[PDB]
PDB file of C-alpha atoms in Angstrom:
ATOM      1  CA  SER A  61     107.480  19.047  68.873  1.00  0.00           C
ATOM      2  CA  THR A  62     107.300  22.730  69.704  1.00  0.00           C
ATOM      3  CA  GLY A  63     104.767  25.551  69.701  1.00  0.00           C
ATOM      4  CA  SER A  64     105.062  29.327  69.549  1.00  0.00           C
ATOM      5  CA  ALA A  65     102.239  31.821  69.989  1.00  0.00           C
ATOM      6  CA  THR A  66     102.071  35.570  70.331  1.00  0.00           C
ATOM      7  CA  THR A  67     100.498  36.955  73.489  1.00  0.00           C
ATOM      8  CA  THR A  68      98.926  40.408  73.398  1.00  0.00           C
ATOM      9  CA  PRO A  69      97.969  42.888  76.130  1.00  0.00           C
ATOM     10  CA  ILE A  70      94.186  43.272  76.489  1.00  0.00           C
ATOM     11  CA  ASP A  71      94.411  47.009  77.071  1.00  0.00           C
ATOM     12  CA  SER A  72      96.746  49.989  77.319  1.00  0.00           C
ATOM     13  CA  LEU A  73      97.733  49.101  80.897  1.00  0.00           C
ATOM     14  CA  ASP A  74      98.789  45.481  80.267  1.00  0.00           C
ATOM     15  CA  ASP A  75      96.071  44.389  82.696  1.00  0.00           C
ATOM     16  CA  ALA A  76      96.330  40.869  81.243  1.00  0.00           C
ATOM     17  CA  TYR A  77      97.529  39.099  78.111  1.00  0.00           C
ATOM     18  CA  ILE A  78      95.597  36.974  75.632  1.00  0.00           C
ATOM     19  CA  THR A  79      96.920  34.204  73.425  1.00  0.00           C
ATOM     20  CA  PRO A  80      94.945  32.583  70.610  1.00  0.00           C
ATOM     21  CA  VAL A  81      94.144  28.909  71.120  1.00  0.00           C
ATOM     22  CA  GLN A  82      92.580  26.509  68.625  1.00  0.00           C
ATOM     23  CA  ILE A  83      89.950  24.193  70.100  1.00  0.00           C
ATOM     24  CA  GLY A  84      88.038  21.462  68.303  1.00  0.00           C
ATOM     25  CA  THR A  85      87.521  20.326  64.724  1.00  0.00           C
ATOM     26  CA  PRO A  86      87.154  22.463  62.708  1.00  0.00           C
ATOM     27  CA  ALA A  87      89.190  24.816  64.862  1.00  0.00           C
ATOM     28  CA  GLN A  88      87.378  27.319  67.070  1.00  0.00           C
ATOM     29  CA  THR A  89      89.886  30.018  68.010  1.00  0.00           C
ATOM     30  CA  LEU A  90      89.473  31.542  71.453  1.00  0.00           C
ATOM     31  CA  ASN A  91      91.713  34.127  73.101  1.00  0.00           C
ATOM     32  CA  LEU A  92      92.779  32.718  76.445  1.00  0.00           C
ATOM     33  CA  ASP A  93      94.604  34.150  79.451  1.00  0.00           C
ATOM     34  CA  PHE A  94      97.620  31.898  79.995  1.00  0.00           C
ATOM     35  CA  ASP A  95      97.874  31.597  83.777  1.00  0.00           C
ATOM     36  CA  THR A  96     100.894  30.014  85.464  1.00  0.00           C
ATOM     37  CA  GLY A  97      99.040  30.436  88.785  1.00  0.00           C
ATOM     38  CA  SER A  98      96.205  28.015  88.034  1.00  0.00           C
ATOM     39  CA  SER A  99      95.660  24.676  86.348  1.00  0.00           C
ATOM     40  CA  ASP A 100      92.274  24.664  84.596  1.00  0.00           C
ATOM     41  CA  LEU A 101      91.702  25.306  80.875  1.00  0.00           C
ATOM     42  CA  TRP A 102      88.200  26.761  80.859  1.00  0.00           C
ATOM     43  CA  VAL A 103      86.250  28.619  78.217  1.00  0.00           C
ATOM     44  CA  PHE A 104      83.160  30.677  77.645  1.00  0.00           C
ATOM     45  CA  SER A 105      80.858  28.350  75.749  1.00  0.00           C
ATOM     46  CA  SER A 106      77.476  27.693  74.226  1.00  0.00           C
ATOM     47  CA  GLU A 107      76.555  26.417  77.718  1.00  0.00           C
ATOM     48  CA  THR A 108      77.389  29.667  79.519  1.00  0.00           C
ATOM     49  CA  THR A 109      74.379  31.430  81.063  1.00  0.00           C
ATOM     50  CA  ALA A 110      73.433  33.897  78.324  1.00  0.00           C
ATOM     51  CA  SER A 111      73.207  36.950  80.592  1.00  0.00           C
ATOM     52  CA  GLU A 112      76.799  36.230  81.639  1.00  0.00           C
ATOM     53  CA  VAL A 113      78.194  36.426  78.109  1.00  0.00           C
ATOM     54  CA  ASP A 114      79.000  39.954  76.897  1.00  0.00           C
ATOM     55  CA  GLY A 115      81.140  39.963  73.764  1.00  0.00           C
ATOM     56  CA  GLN A 116      83.351  36.930  74.368  1.00  0.00           C
ATOM     57  CA  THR A 117      83.950  34.303  71.726  1.00  0.00           C
ATOM     58  CA  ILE A 118      82.379  30.993  72.795  1.00  0.00           C
ATOM     59  CA  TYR A 119      83.347  27.367  72.307  1.00  0.00           C
ATOM     60  CA  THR A 120      80.468  25.306  70.936  1.00  0.00           C
ATOM     61  CA  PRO A 121      81.294  21.653  71.538  1.00  0.00           C
ATOM     62  CA  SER A 122      78.374  20.419  69.446  1.00  0.00           C
ATOM     63  CA  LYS A 123      80.117  21.921  66.379  1.00  0.00           C
ATOM     64  CA  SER A 124      83.341  20.038  67.076  1.00  0.00           C
ATOM     65  CA  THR A 125      83.566  16.536  65.631  1.00  0.00           C
ATOM     66  CA  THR A 126      86.353  15.696  68.085  1.00  0.00           C
ATOM     67  CA  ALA A 127      84.560  16.928  71.250  1.00  0.00           C
ATOM     68  CA  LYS A 128      83.456  14.311  73.759  1.00  0.00           C
ATOM     69  CA  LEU A 129      81.589  15.001  76.966  1.00  0.00           C
ATOM     70  CA  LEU A 130      83.616  13.784  79.929  1.00  0.00           C
ATOM     71  CA  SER A 131      80.816  11.968  81.660  1.00  0.00           C
ATOM     72  CA  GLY A 132      80.014  13.125  85.166  1.00  0.00           C
ATOM     73  CA  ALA A 133      82.855  15.649  85.334  1.00  0.00           C
ATOM     74  CA  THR A 134      82.358  19.124  86.745  1.00  0.00           C
ATOM     75  CA  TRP A 135      84.664  21.956  87.737  1.00  0.00           C
ATOM     76  CA  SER A 136      84.514  25.058  89.878  1.00  0.00           C
ATOM     77  CA  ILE A 137      87.278  27.536  90.586  1.00  0.00           C
ATOM     78  CA  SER A 138      87.758  30.679  92.641  1.00  0.00           C
ATOM     79  CA  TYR A 139      90.699  32.966  91.968  1.00  0.00           C
ATOM     80  CA  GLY A 140      92.770  35.131  94.293  1.00  0.00           C
ATOM     81  CA  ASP A 141      91.086  38.257  92.945  1.00  0.00           C
ATOM     82  CA  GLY A 142      87.653  37.006  94.021  1.00  0.00           C
ATOM     83  CA  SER A 143      86.428  35.965  90.583  1.00  0.00           C
ATOM     84  CA  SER A 144      85.053  32.486  89.852  1.00  0.00           C
ATOM     85  CA  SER A 145      83.562  30.174  87.233  1.00  0.00           C
ATOM     86  CA  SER A 146      82.202  26.629  86.976  1.00  0.00           C
ATOM     87  CA  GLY A 147      80.688  24.097  84.593  1.00  0.00           C
ATOM     88  CA  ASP A 148      81.153  20.726  82.878  1.00  0.00           C
ATOM     89  CA  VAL A 149      83.969  19.167  80.879  1.00  0.00           C
ATOM     90  CA  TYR A 150      84.702  17.998  77.368  1.00  0.00           C
ATOM     91  CA  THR A 151      87.823  16.468  75.923  1.00  0.00           C
ATOM     92  CA  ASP A 152      88.880  17.881  72.564  1.00  0.00           C
ATOM     93  CA  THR A 153      91.857  18.762  70.419  1.00  0.00           C
ATOM     94  CA  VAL A 154      93.683  21.891  71.544  1.00  0.00           C
ATOM     95  CA  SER A 155      96.506  23.604  69.660  1.00  0.00           C
ATOM     96  CA  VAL A 156      98.699  26.505  70.735  1.00  0.00           C
ATOM     97  CA  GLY A 157     101.040  28.049  68.222  1.00  0.00           C
ATOM     98  CA  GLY A 158     101.284  24.847  66.187  1.00  0.00           C
ATOM     99  CA  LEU A 159     101.568  22.446  69.140  1.00  0.00           C
ATOM    100  CA  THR A 160      98.627  20.037  69.332  1.00  0.00           C
ATOM    101  CA  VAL A 161      97.259  17.997  72.250  1.00  0.00           C
ATOM    102  CA  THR A 162      94.497  15.495  71.625  1.00  0.00           C
ATOM    103  CA  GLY A 163      92.156  14.596  74.455  1.00  0.00           C
ATOM    104  CA  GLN A 164      92.741  17.831  76.361  1.00  0.00           C
ATOM    105  CA  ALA A 165      90.210  18.575  79.084  1.00  0.00           C
ATOM    106  CA  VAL A 166      88.323  21.688  77.991  1.00  0.00           C
ATOM    107  CA  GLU A 167      86.244  22.970  80.879  1.00  0.00           C
ATOM    108  CA  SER A 168      83.061  24.546  79.567  1.00  0.00           C
ATOM    109  CA  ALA A 169      81.650  27.339  81.704  1.00  0.00           C
ATOM    110  CA  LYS A 170      78.008  27.195  82.709  1.00  0.00           C
ATOM    111  CA  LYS A 171      78.507  30.131  85.091  1.00  0.00           C
ATOM    112  CA  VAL A 172      81.096  32.915  85.313  1.00  0.00           C
ATOM    113  CA  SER A 173      81.389  35.769  87.812  1.00  0.00           C
ATOM    114  CA  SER A 174      80.775  39.378  86.858  1.00  0.00           C
ATOM    115  CA  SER A 175      84.425  40.325  86.334  1.00  0.00           C
ATOM    116  CA  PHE A 176      84.725  37.701  83.590  1.00  0.00           C
ATOM    117  CA  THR A 177      81.487  38.831  81.941  1.00  0.00           C
ATOM    118  CA  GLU A 178      82.654  42.422  82.066  1.00  0.00           C
ATOM    119  CA  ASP A 179      85.906  41.654  80.272  1.00  0.00           C
ATOM    120  CA  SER A 180      84.961  41.074  76.647  1.00  0.00           C
ATOM    121  CA  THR A 181      88.579  40.414  75.607  1.00  0.00           C
ATOM    122  CA  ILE A 182      89.177  37.213  77.619  1.00  0.00           C
ATOM    123  CA  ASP A 183      87.438  34.071  76.335  1.00  0.00           C
ATOM    124  CA  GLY A 184      88.759  31.854  79.134  1.00  0.00           C
ATOM    125  CA  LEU A 185      91.923  30.741  80.923  1.00  0.00           C
ATOM    126  CA  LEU A 186      94.645  28.247  80.104  1.00  0.00           C
ATOM    127  CA  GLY A 187      96.277  27.102  83.311  1.00  0.00           C
ATOM    128  CA  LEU A 188     100.002  26.375  83.409  1.00  0.00           C
ATOM    129  CA  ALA A 189     100.580  25.678  87.102  1.00  0.00           C
ATOM    130  CA  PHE A 190     100.879  22.087  88.301  1.00  0.00           C
ATOM    131  CA  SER A 191      98.049  19.669  87.553  1.00  0.00           C
ATOM    132  CA  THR A 192      97.597  18.959  91.273  1.00  0.00           C
ATOM    133  CA  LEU A 193      95.610  22.246  91.391  1.00  0.00           C
ATOM    134  CA  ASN A 194      93.183  21.239  88.635  1.00  0.00           C
ATOM    135  CA  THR A 195      89.613  21.459  89.933  1.00  0.00           C
ATOM    136  CA  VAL A 196      87.877  18.815  87.804  1.00  0.00           C
ATOM    137  CA  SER A 197      85.871  16.369  89.871  1.00  0.00           C
ATOM    138  CA  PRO A 198      85.671  13.425  90.413  1.00  0.00           C
ATOM    139  CA  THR A 199      88.690  12.785  88.171  1.00  0.00           C
ATOM    140  CA  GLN A 200      91.326  15.522  88.179  1.00  0.00           C
ATOM    141  CA  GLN A 201      92.574  16.495  84.722  1.00  0.00           C
ATOM    142  CA  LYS A 202      95.978  17.458  83.343  1.00  0.00           C
ATOM    143  CA  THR A 203      97.057  20.870  82.061  1.00  0.00           C
ATOM    144  CA  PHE A 204      97.880  21.492  78.429  1.00  0.00           C
ATOM    145  CA  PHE A 205     101.593  21.589  79.294  1.00  0.00           C
ATOM    146  CA  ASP A 206     101.398  18.379  81.296  1.00  0.00           C
ATOM    147  CA  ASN A 207      99.715  16.634  78.351  1.00  0.00           C
ATOM    148  CA  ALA A 208     102.194  18.017  75.799  1.00  0.00           C
ATOM    149  CA  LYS A 209     105.347  17.573  77.853  1.00  0.00           C
ATOM    150  CA  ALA A 210     106.500  14.145  76.781  1.00  0.00           C
ATOM    151  CA  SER A 211     106.161  15.113  73.108  1.00  0.00           C
ATOM    152  CA  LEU A 212     108.070  18.366  73.432  1.00  0.00           C
ATOM    153  CA  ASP A 213     111.674  18.654  72.261  1.00  0.00           C
ATOM    154  CA  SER A 214     112.487  19.847  75.806  1.00  0.00           C
ATOM    155  CA  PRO A 215     109.990  19.758  78.715  1.00  0.00           C
ATOM    156  CA  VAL A 216     109.769  23.537  79.073  1.00  0.00           C
ATOM    157  CA  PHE A 217     107.694  26.555  78.213  1.00  0.00           C
ATOM    158  CA  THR A 218     108.782  30.180  78.242  1.00  0.00           C
ATOM    159  CA  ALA A 219     106.984  33.445  78.910  1.00  0.00           C
ATOM    160  CA  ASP A 220     108.218  36.593  77.220  1.00  0.00           C
ATOM    161  CA  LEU A 221     105.627  39.229  78.064  1.00  0.00           C
ATOM    162  CA  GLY A 222     105.847  42.667  76.510  1.00  0.00           C
ATOM    163  CA  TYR A 223     105.529  46.087  78.103  1.00  0.00           C
ATOM    164  CA  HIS A 224     102.749  47.825  76.188  1.00  0.00           C
ATOM    165  CA  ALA A 225     103.536  45.439  73.336  1.00  0.00           C
ATOM    166  CA  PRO A 226     102.991  41.846  72.216  1.00  0.00           C
ATOM    167  CA  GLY A 227     105.208  39.030  73.456  1.00  0.00           C
ATOM    168  CA  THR A 228     105.538  35.287  73.123  1.00  0.00           C
ATOM    169  CA  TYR A 229     104.779  31.968  74.773  1.00  0.00           C
ATOM    170  CA  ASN A 230     106.997  29.153  73.486  1.00  0.00           C
ATOM    171  CA  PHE A 231     106.585  25.459  74.224  1.00  0.00           C
ATOM    172  CA  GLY A 232     109.349  22.924  73.956  1.00  0.00           C
ATOM    173  CA  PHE A 233     112.367  25.147  73.232  1.00  0.00           C
ATOM    174  CA  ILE A 234     114.338  28.129  74.488  1.00  0.00           C
ATOM    175  CA  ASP A 235     114.728  30.928  71.936  1.00  0.00           C
ATOM    176  CA  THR A 236     118.286  32.023  72.584  1.00  0.00           C
ATOM    177  CA  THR A 237     117.734  35.219  70.560  1.00  0.00           C
ATOM    178  CA  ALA A 238     114.961  36.408  72.900  1.00  0.00           C
ATOM    179  CA  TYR A 239     117.092  37.439  75.881  1.00  0.00           C
ATOM    180  CA  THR A 240     120.413  39.060  76.760  1.00  0.00           C
ATOM    181  CA  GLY A 241     123.188  37.556  78.862  1.00  0.00           C
ATOM    182  CA  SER A 242     122.510  34.236  80.568  1.00  0.00           C
ATOM    183  CA  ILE A 243     119.495  32.544  82.062  1.00  0.00           C
ATOM    184  CA  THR A 244     119.825  32.091  85.829  1.00  0.00           C
ATOM    185  CA  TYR A 245     117.972  29.073  87.128  1.00  0.00           C
ATOM    186  CA  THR A 246     116.543  28.828  90.607  1.00  0.00           C
ATOM    187  CA  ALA A 247     114.833  26.116  92.668  1.00  0.00           C
ATOM    188  CA  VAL A 248     111.088  25.558  92.632  1.00  0.00           C
ATOM    189  CA  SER A 249     108.799  24.106  95.261  1.00  0.00           C
ATOM    190  CA  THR A 250     105.703  22.446  93.840  1.00  0.00           C
ATOM    191  CA  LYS A 251     104.221  21.756  97.294  1.00  0.00           C
ATOM    192  CA  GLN A 252     101.420  24.313  96.846  1.00  0.00           C
ATOM    193  CA  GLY A 253     100.994  23.487  93.151  1.00  0.00           C
ATOM    194  CA  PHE A 254     102.609  26.741  92.002  1.00  0.00           C
ATOM    195  CA  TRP A 255     105.859  27.750  90.341  1.00  0.00           C
ATOM    196  CA  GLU A 256     107.074  28.820  93.772  1.00  0.00           C
ATOM    197  CA  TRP A 257     110.620  30.111  94.200  1.00  0.00           C
ATOM    198  CA  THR A 258     112.721  32.345  96.439  1.00  0.00           C
ATOM    199  CA  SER A 259     114.065  35.682  95.276  1.00  0.00           C
ATOM    200  CA  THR A 260     117.378  36.699  96.832  1.00  0.00           C
ATOM    201  CA  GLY A 261     116.412  40.321  97.460  1.00  0.00           C
ATOM    202  CA  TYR A 262     115.612  43.706  96.001  1.00  0.00           C
ATOM    203  CA  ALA A 263     116.698  47.271  95.297  1.00  0.00           C
ATOM    204  CA  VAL A 264     114.714  50.474  94.792  1.00  0.00           C
ATOM    205  CA  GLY A 265     115.964  52.723  92.002  1.00  0.00           C
ATOM    206  CA  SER A 266     119.710  53.227  92.186  1.00  0.00           C
ATOM    207  CA  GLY A 267     119.729  52.165  95.830  1.00  0.00           C
ATOM    208  CA  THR A 268     121.773  49.395  97.385  1.00  0.00           C
ATOM    209  CA  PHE A 269     120.632  45.813  97.026  1.00  0.00           C
ATOM    210  CA  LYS A 270     119.020  44.295 100.112  1.00  0.00           C
ATOM    211  CA  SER A 271     119.823  40.598 100.435  1.00  0.00           C
ATOM    212  CA  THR A 272     116.729  38.919 101.816  1.00  0.00           C
ATOM    213  CA  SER A 273     114.800  35.783 100.904  1.00  0.00           C
ATOM    214  CA  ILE A 274     111.400  36.431  99.349  1.00  0.00           C
ATOM    215  CA  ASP A 275     109.339  33.308  98.663  1.00  0.00           C
ATOM    216  CA  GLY A 276     106.729  33.825  95.978  1.00  0.00           C
ATOM    217  CA  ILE A 277     105.079  32.498  92.832  1.00  0.00           C
ATOM    218  CA  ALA A 278     105.737  33.217  89.179  1.00  0.00           C
ATOM    219  CA  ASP A 279     102.194  34.032  88.071  1.00  0.00           C
ATOM    220  CA  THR A 280     101.432  35.231  84.556  1.00  0.00           C
ATOM    221  CA  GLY A 281      97.732  35.456  85.457  1.00  0.00           C
ATOM    222  CA  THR A 282      98.248  38.161  88.074  1.00  0.00           C
ATOM    223  CA  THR A 283      98.736  41.713  86.820  1.00  0.00           C
ATOM    224  CA  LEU A 284     100.789  43.265  89.595  1.00  0.00           C
ATOM    225  CA  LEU A 285     103.781  42.539  91.800  1.00  0.00           C
ATOM    226  CA  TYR A 286     102.718  41.673  95.364  1.00  0.00           C
ATOM    227  CA  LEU A 287     105.490  41.709  97.961  1.00  0.00           C
ATOM    228  CA  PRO A 288     105.900  41.985 101.735  1.00  0.00           C
ATOM    229  CA  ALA A 289     104.722  45.246 103.272  1.00  0.00           C
ATOM    230  CA  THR A 290     108.239  46.186 104.338  1.00  0.00           C
ATOM    231  CA  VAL A 291     109.513  45.953 100.756  1.00  0.00           C
ATOM    232  CA  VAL A 292     106.540  47.786  99.295  1.00  0.00           C
ATOM    233  CA  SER A 293     106.828  50.591 101.852  1.00  0.00           C
ATOM    234  CA  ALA A 294     110.503  51.011 101.001  1.00  0.00           C
ATOM    235  CA  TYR A 295     109.610  51.349  97.312  1.00  0.00           C
ATOM    236  CA  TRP A 296     106.810  53.892  97.662  1.00  0.00           C
ATOM    237  CA  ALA A 297     108.762  55.957 100.183  1.00  0.00           C
ATOM    238  CA  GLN A 298     110.904  56.978  97.192  1.00  0.00           C
ATOM    239  CA  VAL A 299     107.905  58.510  95.391  1.00  0.00           C
ATOM    240  CA  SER A 300     106.844  61.943  96.633  1.00  0.00           C
ATOM    241  CA  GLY A 301     103.196  61.970  97.586  1.00  0.00           C
ATOM    242  CA  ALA A 302     102.695  58.203  97.370  1.00  0.00           C
ATOM    243  CA  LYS A 303     100.478  56.689 100.038  1.00  0.00           C
ATOM    244  CA  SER A 304      98.513  53.568 100.811  1.00  0.00           C
ATOM    245  CA  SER A 305      94.807  54.231 100.395  1.00  0.00           C
ATOM    246  CA  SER A 306      92.366  51.848 102.081  1.00  0.00           C
ATOM    247  CA  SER A 307      89.527  53.370 100.058  1.00  0.00           C
ATOM    248  CA  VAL A 308      91.256  52.706  96.727  1.00  0.00           C
ATOM    249  CA  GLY A 309      92.744  49.383  97.832  1.00  0.00           C
ATOM    250  CA  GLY A 310      96.470  49.956  97.760  1.00  0.00           C
ATOM    251  CA  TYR A 311      99.270  52.349  97.083  1.00  0.00           C
ATOM    252  CA  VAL A 312      98.494  55.322  94.905  1.00  0.00           C
ATOM    253  CA  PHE A 313     100.795  58.061  93.699  1.00  0.00           C
ATOM    254  CA  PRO A 314     100.622  61.404  91.922  1.00  0.00           C
ATOM    255  CA  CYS A 315     100.322  60.809  88.213  1.00  0.00           C
ATOM    256  CA  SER A 316     102.947  63.559  87.743  1.00  0.00           C
ATOM    257  CA  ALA A 317     105.623  61.409  89.431  1.00  0.00           C
ATOM    258  CA  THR A 318     108.582  59.776  87.757  1.00  0.00           C
ATOM    259  CA  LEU A 319     108.691  56.282  89.252  1.00  0.00           C
ATOM    260  CA  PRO A 320     111.942  54.608  90.273  1.00  0.00           C
ATOM    261  CA  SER A 321     112.866  51.183  89.002  1.00  0.00           C
ATOM    262  CA  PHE A 322     112.600  48.064  91.137  1.00  0.00           C
ATOM    263  CA  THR A 323     115.204  45.302  91.033  1.00  0.00           C
ATOM    264  CA  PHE A 324     114.657  41.725  92.230  1.00  0.00           C
ATOM    265  CA  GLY A 325     117.270  39.037  92.730  1.00  0.00           C
ATOM    266  CA  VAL A 326     117.382  35.644  91.070  1.00  0.00           C
ATOM    267  CA  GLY A 327     120.353  33.939  92.655  1.00  0.00           C
ATOM    268  CA  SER A 328     123.279  36.276  92.064  1.00  0.00           C
ATOM    269  CA  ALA A 329     121.484  37.759  89.025  1.00  0.00           C
ATOM    270  CA  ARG A 330     119.297  40.875  88.968  1.00  0.00           C
ATOM    271  CA  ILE A 331     116.135  41.691  87.019  1.00  0.00           C
ATOM    272  CA  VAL A 332     115.376  45.400  86.686  1.00  0.00           C
ATOM    273  CA  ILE A 333     111.739  46.502  86.373  1.00  0.00           C
ATOM    274  CA  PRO A 334     111.721  50.002  84.851  1.00  0.00           C
ATOM    275  CA  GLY A 335     109.710  52.615  86.714  1.00  0.00           C
ATOM    276  CA  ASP A 336     107.184  53.009  83.918  1.00  0.00           C
ATOM    277  CA  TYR A 337     106.176  49.322  84.307  1.00  0.00           C
ATOM    278  CA  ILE A 338     104.892  50.193  87.780  1.00  0.00           C
ATOM    279  CA  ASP A 339     102.401  52.849  86.536  1.00  0.00           C
ATOM    280  CA  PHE A 340      98.819  51.549  86.255  1.00  0.00           C
ATOM    281  CA  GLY A 341      97.304  54.922  85.500  1.00  0.00           C
ATOM    282  CA  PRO A 342      94.491  56.991  86.968  1.00  0.00           C
ATOM    283  CA  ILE A 343      92.444  55.328  89.705  1.00  0.00           C
ATOM    284  CA  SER A 344      89.329  56.561  87.892  1.00  0.00           C
ATOM    285  CA  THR A 345      88.960  58.328  84.571  1.00  0.00           C
ATOM    286  CA  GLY A 346      90.351  61.851  84.754  1.00  0.00           C
ATOM    287  CA  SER A 347      91.942  61.451  88.185  1.00  0.00           C
ATOM    288  CA  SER A 348      95.472  62.715  88.893  1.00  0.00           C
ATOM    289  CA  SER A 349      95.949  59.915  91.412  1.00  0.00           C
ATOM    290  CA  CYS A 350      97.537  56.859  89.803  1.00  0.00           C
ATOM    291  CA  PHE A 351      97.481  53.227  90.911  1.00  0.00           C
ATOM    292  CA  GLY A 352     100.763  51.532  91.756  1.00  0.00           C
ATOM    293  CA  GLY A 353     102.031  48.344  90.188  1.00  0.00           C
ATOM    294  CA  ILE A 354     103.800  47.152  93.325  1.00  0.00           C
ATOM    295  CA  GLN A 355     101.409  46.355  96.171  1.00  0.00           C
ATOM    296  CA  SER A 356     101.496  44.612  99.533  1.00  0.00           C
ATOM    297  CA  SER A 357     100.896  40.873  99.723  1.00  0.00           C
ATOM    298  CA  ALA A 358      99.898  41.166 103.381  1.00  0.00           C
ATOM    299  CA  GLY A 359      96.596  39.340 103.670  1.00  0.00           C
ATOM    300  CA  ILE A 360      97.069  37.452 100.377  1.00  0.00           C
ATOM    301  CA  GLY A 361      99.161  34.908 102.223  1.00  0.00           C
ATOM    302  CA  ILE A 362     101.701  34.605  99.426  1.00  0.00           C
ATOM    303  CA  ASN A 363     104.004  36.890  97.461  1.00  0.00           C
ATOM    304  CA  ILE A 364     103.198  37.063  93.758  1.00  0.00           C
ATOM    305  CA  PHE A 365     105.634  37.833  90.962  1.00  0.00           C
ATOM    306  CA  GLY A 366     102.910  38.838  88.513  1.00  0.00           C
ATOM    307  CA  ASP A 367     103.142  40.449  85.097  1.00  0.00           C
ATOM    308  CA  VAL A 368     104.818  43.640  86.363  1.00  0.00           C
ATOM    309  CA  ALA A 369     107.822  41.521  87.332  1.00  0.00           C
ATOM    310  CA  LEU A 370     107.694  38.800  84.698  1.00  0.00           C
ATOM    311  CA  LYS A 371     107.446  41.198  81.754  1.00  0.00           C
ATOM    312  CA  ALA A 372     110.874  42.589  82.706  1.00  0.00           C
ATOM    313  CA  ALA A 373     112.363  39.128  82.033  1.00  0.00           C
ATOM    314  CA  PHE A 374     112.525  36.151  79.750  1.00  0.00           C
ATOM    315  CA  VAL A 375     111.164  33.399  81.977  1.00  0.00           C
ATOM    316  CA  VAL A 376     111.737  29.653  81.631  1.00  0.00           C
ATOM    317  CA  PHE A 377     109.237  27.316  83.245  1.00  0.00           C
ATOM    318  CA  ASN A 378     111.296  24.117  83.300  1.00  0.00           C
ATOM    319  CA  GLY A 379     109.060  21.097  83.746  1.00  0.00           C
ATOM    320  CA  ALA A 380     111.854  18.563  84.077  1.00  0.00           C
ATOM    321  CA  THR A 381     111.460  15.812  86.689  1.00  0.00           C
ATOM    322  CA  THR A 382     112.675  18.365  89.227  1.00  0.00           C
ATOM    323  CA  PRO A 383     111.138  21.610  87.996  1.00  0.00           C
ATOM    324  CA  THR A 384     113.074  24.877  88.055  1.00  0.00           C
ATOM    325  CA  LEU A 385     112.543  28.464  86.937  1.00  0.00           C
ATOM    326  CA  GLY A 386     114.914  30.489  84.794  1.00  0.00           C
ATOM    327  CA  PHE A 387     115.132  34.254  84.450  1.00  0.00           C
ATOM    328  CA  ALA A 388     117.086  36.354  81.971  1.00  0.00           C
ATOM    329  CA  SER A 389     117.174  40.044  81.212  1.00  0.00           C
ATOM    330  CA  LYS A 390     116.001  41.024  77.736  1.00  0.00           C
TER     331      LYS A 390
END
């Protein structure tokens, strides 16, 4: 089997991407944030504290003839950005772009943190990291991909995120028309439960490539590109007036700037992030100070190849017995 679904930016900045997901019988369609940095499929629901729901579409398990309460199971997750959610668990039928899993754990939120409430466009998350990170207790549950894998034509999914435009998540096949040149594959460590890999280096604009190993995670659920402070400083030094602002929370730059591109290495291959991908707009409405899309990972504890990086590529998440990642230009 295969599946193919369009993923759409939630706003004009590509702050996140939503993909429609069918849950239950009859189908209840929710728009979920596909997150290769986590491993829980959780949804706003009829059980979510009412004051914490503000415009989201909810899953109502009592209206699904295929929903079954997973007795005794609870979940609770905290994300790198400080947000969190928790609740109980159903199993139900879940379909993405024509690919169906029966008995998928659907984690129903009883509580969500303010940032989730405040984002009306995201109805929940669909985790695509390794199932070892799944938070369901006392019996850990499998991700949608993990459940689908054996049925797929090939045990892979691909992320093709757009810049200011829709893109595609495919399951079970590689669309050879969706990228240019070749896909370069690179080793993955699953030891921390992430799609963790090592970039071979970087360049800023038309500058020379610096060969240096950068370990980090391919994370579709993180907006920006978080890299070591040395790398980030080298980038922003090429933008007149750019500075790191403790009050804002990272590098800012004059909105009148033309940003240079940023290149990262995948083996001997190179992915070029155009300068415009690195512009996240005014820090506050009407400001002429703009927020940068490349930020320091110092104090995160890990480098994160988030959407800023991934949207410059066609990305293969290869869930073979020994997982690997593939990157192509597009």
